Design a protein around this ligand. Sequence first.
Ligand SMILES: NC(=O)C1=CN([C@@H]2O[C@H](COP(=O)(O)OP(=O)(O)OC[C@H]3O[C@@H](n4cnc5c(N)ncnc54)[C@H](OP(=O)(O)O)[C@@H]3O)[C@@H](O)[C@H]2O)C=CC1
Lengths: 498, 498, 498, 498
Amino acid sequence: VINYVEKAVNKLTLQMPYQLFIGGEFVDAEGSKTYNTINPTDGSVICQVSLAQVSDVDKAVAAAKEAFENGLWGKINARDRGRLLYRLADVMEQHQEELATIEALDAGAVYTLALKTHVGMSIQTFRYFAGWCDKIQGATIPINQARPNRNLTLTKKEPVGVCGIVIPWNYPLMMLSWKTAACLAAGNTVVIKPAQVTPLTALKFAELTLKAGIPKGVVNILPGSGSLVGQRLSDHPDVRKIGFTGSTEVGKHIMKSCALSNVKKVSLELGGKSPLIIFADCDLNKAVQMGMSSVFFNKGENSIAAGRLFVEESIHNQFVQKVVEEVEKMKIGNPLERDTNHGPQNHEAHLRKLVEYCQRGVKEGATLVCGGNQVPRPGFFFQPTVFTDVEDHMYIAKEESFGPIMIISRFADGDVDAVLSRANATEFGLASGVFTRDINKALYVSDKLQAGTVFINTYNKTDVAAPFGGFKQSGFGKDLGEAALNEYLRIKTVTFEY
Amino acid sequence: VINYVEKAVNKLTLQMPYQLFIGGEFVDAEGSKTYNTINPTDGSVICQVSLAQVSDVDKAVAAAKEAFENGLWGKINARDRGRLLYRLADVMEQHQEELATIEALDAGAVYTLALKTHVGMSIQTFRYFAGWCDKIQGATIPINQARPNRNLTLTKKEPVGVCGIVIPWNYPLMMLSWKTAACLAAGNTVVIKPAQVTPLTALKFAELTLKAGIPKGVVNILPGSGSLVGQRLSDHPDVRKIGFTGSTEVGKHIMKSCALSNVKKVSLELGGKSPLIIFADCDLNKAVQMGMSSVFFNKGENSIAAGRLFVEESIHNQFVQKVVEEVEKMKIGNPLERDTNHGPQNHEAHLRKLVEYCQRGVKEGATLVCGGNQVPRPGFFFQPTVFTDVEDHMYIAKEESFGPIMIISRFADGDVDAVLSRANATEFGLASGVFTRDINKALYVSDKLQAGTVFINTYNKTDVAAPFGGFKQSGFGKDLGEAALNEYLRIKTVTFEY
Amino acid sequence: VINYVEKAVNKLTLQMPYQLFIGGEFVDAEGSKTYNTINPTDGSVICQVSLAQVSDVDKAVAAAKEAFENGLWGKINARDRGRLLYRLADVMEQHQEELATIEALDAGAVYTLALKTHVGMSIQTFRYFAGWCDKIQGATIPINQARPNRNLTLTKKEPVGVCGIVIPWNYPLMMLSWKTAACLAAGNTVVIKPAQVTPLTALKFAELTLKAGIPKGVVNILPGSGSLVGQRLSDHPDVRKIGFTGSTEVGKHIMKSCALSNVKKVSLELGGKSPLIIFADCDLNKAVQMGMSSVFFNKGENSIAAGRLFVEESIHNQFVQKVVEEVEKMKIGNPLERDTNHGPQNHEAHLRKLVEYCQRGVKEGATLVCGGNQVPRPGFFFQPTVFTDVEDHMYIAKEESFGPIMIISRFADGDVDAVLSRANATEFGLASGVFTRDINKALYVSDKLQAGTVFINTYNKTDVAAPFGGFKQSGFGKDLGEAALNEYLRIKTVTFEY
Amino acid sequence: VINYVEKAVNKLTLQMPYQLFIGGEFVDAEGSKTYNTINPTDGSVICQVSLAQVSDVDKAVAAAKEAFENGLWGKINARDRGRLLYRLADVMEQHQEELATIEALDAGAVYTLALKTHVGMSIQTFRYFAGWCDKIQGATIPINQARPNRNLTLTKKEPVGVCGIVIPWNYPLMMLSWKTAACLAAGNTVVIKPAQVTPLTALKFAELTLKAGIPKGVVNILPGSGSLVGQRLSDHPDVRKIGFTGSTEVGKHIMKSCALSNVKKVSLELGGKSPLIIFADCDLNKAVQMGMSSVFFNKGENSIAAGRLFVEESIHNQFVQKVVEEVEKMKIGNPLERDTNHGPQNHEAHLRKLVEYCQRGVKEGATLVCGGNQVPRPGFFFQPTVFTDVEDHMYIAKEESFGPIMIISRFADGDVDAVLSRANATEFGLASGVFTRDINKALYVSDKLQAGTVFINTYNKTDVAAPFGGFKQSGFGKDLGEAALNEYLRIKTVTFEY
Ligand SMILES: NC(=O)C1=CN([C@@H]2O[C@H](COP(=O)(O)OP(=O)(O)OC[C@H]3O[C@@H](n4cnc5c(N)ncnc54)[C@H](OP(=O)(O)O)[C@@H]3O)[C@@H](O)[C@H]2O)C=CC1
């Protein structure tokens, strides 16, 4: 029997494992270390989770390795691997109300949105990649012949081996799903550091793999400190690929950790400060509604959030005036109310960091139209914020706030290259939008945006089949899509003479 | 006018440029520093070559930037870009006796060989990758439509931009070509740091790009030090991809450097203690001749050289008795004589380490069948070496010689799983091979060998179209082949709603 | 509510629908016409099946048309489409025993093999292609720009639309699944003529598509005669693609009809006289077992069946002596019994054909070493046959038997080139194989063989991810693999200028 | 030495061969027959060209057959076959003035434009496919392993063998090139029937292969009658692929011929009544210039020409008004004079149909805005014609003009679905186009147009890398693009077990 933290809430009776997941069992940490996970809706302790120690990493990696080298996962057909990864999705469906609720407590996600996006996309991801298994192909190549003999060259795509996946707190299960699916589909096995503050969905997922008959020790999950658990993963000489999603500063440290250990492969999806340019000739009402989502989605905690909205001179004051009308209607409150539009922030820390961010923007001149402060009420809620009169040199114009904060800069009518320019003025390069009814501006601003993803007359429409990565300092590699896979496969050329 | 360094040799008149090639003109380095390049056939100073400084990297990098961002290379058609790259091929072809010589002279490549391989394969690289120019395609993906609307998702394959290429000395021009061609074909501008000790053929190529009509600033060559020029490239906040081929130790360092500045893309292609398994049932004549080749080609100064030979017991003795016979037939001598077929080592530095290598080899009680000394003549000649009785734990079964030192071990008659286990016991995995007539043995071995290439009844069968790379700590990323372009490309995802 | 011919057998209760399936429901044919389907084991009547009429092919085709044009099937995201195709696979699994049981009864397929291949490989198909749904991808081509302007060129893969699938009697459900999967996965809609003589699995599967949620009229099955109902599909001006699998002289007639009606795409999987060449250097025990499989598999009613065994002289007599031994052991009898390995032939008609094929084989002087007669038991049982001293000119050497008749020819010890030649000497080109332990002989033979599959050291190993097609008068196009989708897609090029 | 018909024009000495090209040499017809090819600028007999007879096809085929099976074409590297075609591209470029001249003489193509397009794109086409030669890769596929053993599945792409090409008269050289290039590049050898009326550029190319070193037999050109030389190709037992571009009527016929012959692979590029929908919010002035070229380009002898111009109401009057002012500015006249916009039609018989077309036009109720008559000057010039008030039942809405005949219909304001549906109301579907400034329209429409190409805000913007092909009765299969290779390759699946 797996040990649960049992909690009756939201018409369910949650059974949450709270332990380490190493080789198929749920165990205590070395020395039975533990920490609390905080419910950000009221700031209470949810329960206590195992605190993975360095020994524990080594143990996890050793399980995964064995499980890849001699374990069932390594021997089965590509096709049958898919079968399991579909089952895995399937189980995840059958538990979705649960998973979403957990996520609702643990990360403060709105339970309706947790359902559709956090859990939904998750379920979707596994299904997608599941499909890619008997479809990962190599080539035969027309190598010059070494006459009077013949030659055949072929490639094989092989797994890379033991992987470490290290992820942040904004969409706990979702992130975990994105990479792990790609990882497991490519035939690898894995140790997962979920963000320390958000362990619960990750662990429940652990259990689910069991129910899916994921072979013992292909998946391993270790709640715990990045500085320690995550650090070992990168240093460990038996792991051979890191998948990372996190802050720029750590990503830099990670890549470094990888080079100094054993030149492991590494993928980075770091920050964004993505510009959304809204033209006067767009659909002004859809632009307020799309562009609010481009900031407020998942309480702002989001990689592709629009860091800046650039708005044609002619439509600006009316766009703002409209956004404030809409913002006043946004329902703040507990994630478990079907009611709620806007939930609480992920953990205290980040609310305090959001508080200062906004102090600071006001300090340096920008106009604070609304919000910019904690919502006074228990738990850690933050008022949707709108800044205007934001200028290119400002902190708030350069820095990734990662919270419900609209940053609006006007762009003078009928230059394009001149705003394009200001939008590519960052070292971030992850996402970007353009709203216009004009085909030419769209197609053009779409080449010129120095960013991995360009939304056109929409926002936040990632999909599990379209590749997702960064340029410049947003990192490299892709998540989701056929091209998320090359991160987790390797290519062997085989040359015969005959 | 260009400053040449004329030299009458091999029935030709070399005119060898010898300065930094920045901004598409040849220039002196900061404050006119220079250094000597040495002929490894008589230890003489060939001529003086410019010593690029930090101030010079900075210009070269910012000359490549301008050349991408505002220059003609940034705007011509993709089909037209590749047209320029083919031109370059035939310019290089028309300079093939001249180029095979500068190589013979500068890196001690046997002349017939430089012509065929150093320079000939360099030519085919460019023809090959100019072909890919307008065949680099993106995709359109069947994204989930956001009813009641529609979406369109596509990927554009864009250039990365300003690239650093840092190469070694063993095939000065070919390693330059393999990497440059891909990069330039994907549409990038480059700064190239050749191996300090082999700046000649790179500089000539520098001239030849002017001849082709490559726009000024696309191609930039800085002869100099790895610890100064090399390092600045990887630190530069404006370089975005570092392609690298060299030592494991240096490799590890580059990645860390890349990590630390601006998360720049990196592809390492490092050492290789590559195993060749020879079963009782191959053509034993071919086995020898081919296995010889797998060690002695280009004075064994070759990333993929068979680092070990494992010869099945039943034929071990007779294979060694055959290899020796063949080694004696080898004519050692000056790269430019027609009758020569084993030239000198690249430079003093290295010939010294090779000496030390076999020393240690004998110290550890592996038995020396022949060679292992510096041939007594002037220059840097190393004698074709054979070891036998090399046990797995020994130094000379672990580190990389990169000199013509055939290193032979026994495996027991009708083992397979064990020889393999032995052959894979290295932290390298770049190349490997197996001679055998048993389709089953053949295909299984090539499954199981933990290495980027597996030759099968052949060796040193690289082809511009077959991807060349490393697993484990031999690195990551591919050179040559379609898959190479991946390292010089980025994917932008465009998601339209409508 | 549906009408079933209900039958208690094989530890279950068959409930087979016996009607045309048209646009959602099961209806009787024009003025209630019907025919008999004959159980091949005892010769009995299984039941009455509706006999579709020209009037009905029209009913069906236009059902499919609506279903494609404003019907739900062509609106659902590509991904949800795969979901339905996956659910249909789950349902087929759920009903697998029933389905094999009908297949056994209807086509006389040994029930163990039917489970694994007929039903098994069918269930595998619909899953394999279900996965391809949201991974069918277009491209962005980097087209020459029309300076001073800019262009973008993309492709979209799209459905061809209403399709006709016309299939034979040897693997009724399987032939249907192979093609229908592909068809449905590319998002078409479809009318199907199963072979008149075997309509039953076909119609069951229709019921199954209802269980699945496949929407009304996406699939329609019309049991009926080729020369009426099929001739109609191939003439119909609203069908835009035909996938045929059948005889040659009928293949030709279809293409001819497709030309004349509306230049509808056609794809043909026709005859075979597939050569299998057996060298003395193989595992000769594994070669009788693999080589009787090549002919006998599913009673020799099997397009890639080895129509012709060339056996190297030195092992010829011992190969025959051994087959003969293994042929005695084969248990002939009721498909539904556990111990039976050789089933009855599909229908009375085809049986007489084989009796005569073998008469005619003796007449020209081939040496009936065993078999050639019908088995003295009720129903339609045919003696596994073996012929030797069979010459390149003989009828049985040239013509396609489609039955359990191994046709053995000697070739000369040493020859490779001269046998290869007599095995390519055919206007057929569907399969071929080679047994040999020698990697050289093996790759070289598979180059030189003129056929769309070459089996090396194995045979009859088809699989859903690997494409299956003919060369020469065996036809063209692919069944299975990613490449069968190309026949069920079209390509629109979109070039913008902007 | 080759006989020419030498002629001095355009400050040039054309040497034009006029004989059958068969087996790498220029030879006479059987019993030396010939016929006259007729300059359309004035009507003069340009010269007597050879008239290929049936035994002349048997020879051409059998040449290409030897040339493929034993010839150098299929023993050389894929990389070298490539070289040979790049070289041929340069021989074309060196001869481009002459070739563009011959074209303007033989098929009356404005020389200004013959150079840039007829010849320029031919030259680009050979350089395109040349670079595809060594990049036609196969696959390795994750086959289900037959445990306890193992399996390996690869695909080789091989050439199809001897092909026939049959072309129309409108871009004699460019068509020959679109096809011949991709065919030869796929590794095939060919027999090409130029349109009877235009042998001249095809024969010079025939000679040009000789200069370029194309192995004797690889390219065979035979001018003659469609129903004699044409037919015998499509009938011949040794031809395996027929690539054809022409009338739908002939197309149906050729398909049927391939059917009765030997199920030779075919690929039709038939007619087209290509619709162009021009919204009211487009750039008006540009839409004119574009829209006019949509029809008038290359005297309208271009199969993707807009055969229908739906012009939104609010602007239809102003548009016709503008289109007229610009027609007046076009200069009719000798193709050879630099100042000429609109040259003659290809031959008498076509001009006669053109006159009858607009005869039937005015007759039915069309408003003839301008033109519709043969220009009064010698030769075959046809006045650029505009009609309006063209209703949907009119014969000029349904048939293919293939001349300079703009055919304009009104549509209601803001009324997309309706005009769409009008535009799709054809059995053709070769091209379409939309001029609009609004992205949602532009994209929507390009979904819904039932055609193989959709130009958006441009037209006649084909490109050697973008695939070109028709839907419905405009045929199937693509020319140009990677796409195009699929027509000239076969896929061999090779499945090992080991
Ligand atoms: N979609 C596309 O790729 C393109 C299509 N086209 C189409 O081409 C057409 C113009 O050609 P048009 O001359 O009117 O008609 P055709 O189709 O008859 O002309 C094409 C060719 O067919 C030949 N031919 C006639 N009968 C046979 C036969 N039995 N077997 C083999 N070949 C035969 C003709 O020979 P002969 O010289 O004796 O007539 C000619 O070479 C237009 O309808 C246009 O739409 C044009 C360009 C591109």
